[PDB]
Write a protein that binds this ligand. Structure first.
Ligand SMILES: C=C[C@H]1CN(Cc2ccccn2)C(=O)[C@@H]2CCC[C@H]1N2[S@](=N)(=O)c1cc(Cl)cc(Cl)c1
Length: 128
């Protein structure tokens, strides 16, 4: 399925090239510009654990998730990954725990040492 495919066919987007965050572009977005640090980013997403459970979805809430890029309001992989996306892009990310919730996990949804899968759509980015 999609998690296996990004695991086996994704590209390393980390600065360290430690394969901690792999990406596949599913739908090419608009032009060349990606958001900058401090932008208010609006995304839709779905997240799955390695046991197949969908642990979250903005679609299911009928509202986008909004955060300020690059300010550590989200897991490291999101700040890294969303920063690579164009407006309108849909991407898959496969994230090792060192770029997500590590040995702690995040109670109750995320276990310790969890590799995470996301599908993310960048809706809009604005501001700083
Ligand atoms: C809508 C909540 C976000 C939570 N965070 C930041 C955060 C804030 C507080 C505690 C744990 N993580 C995040 O960094 C990431 C990435 C952006 C979407 C989503 N999460 S998430 N991984 O989907 C998620 C989803 C759910 Cl239902 C619970 C948790 Cl603990 C984490």
């Amino acid at each position: 399925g999609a998690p296996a495919t990004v695991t086996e066919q994704g590209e390393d987007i980390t600065s360290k090239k430690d394969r901690g965050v792999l990406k596949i572009v599913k739908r090419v977005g608009n032009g060349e510009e990606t958001p900058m640090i401090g932008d208010k980013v609006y995304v839709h997403y779905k997240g799955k654990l390695s046991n197949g459970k969908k642990f979250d979805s903005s679609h299911d809430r009928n509202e986008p998730f909004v955060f300020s890029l690059g300010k550590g309001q989200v897991i490291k992989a999101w700040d890294i990954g969303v920063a690579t996306m164009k407006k309108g892009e849909i991407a898959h990310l496969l994230i090792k725990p060192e770029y997500a919730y590590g040995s702690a996990g995040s109670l109750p949804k995320i276990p310790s040492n969890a590799t995470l899968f996301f599908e993310i759509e960048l809706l809009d980015f604005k501001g700083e």
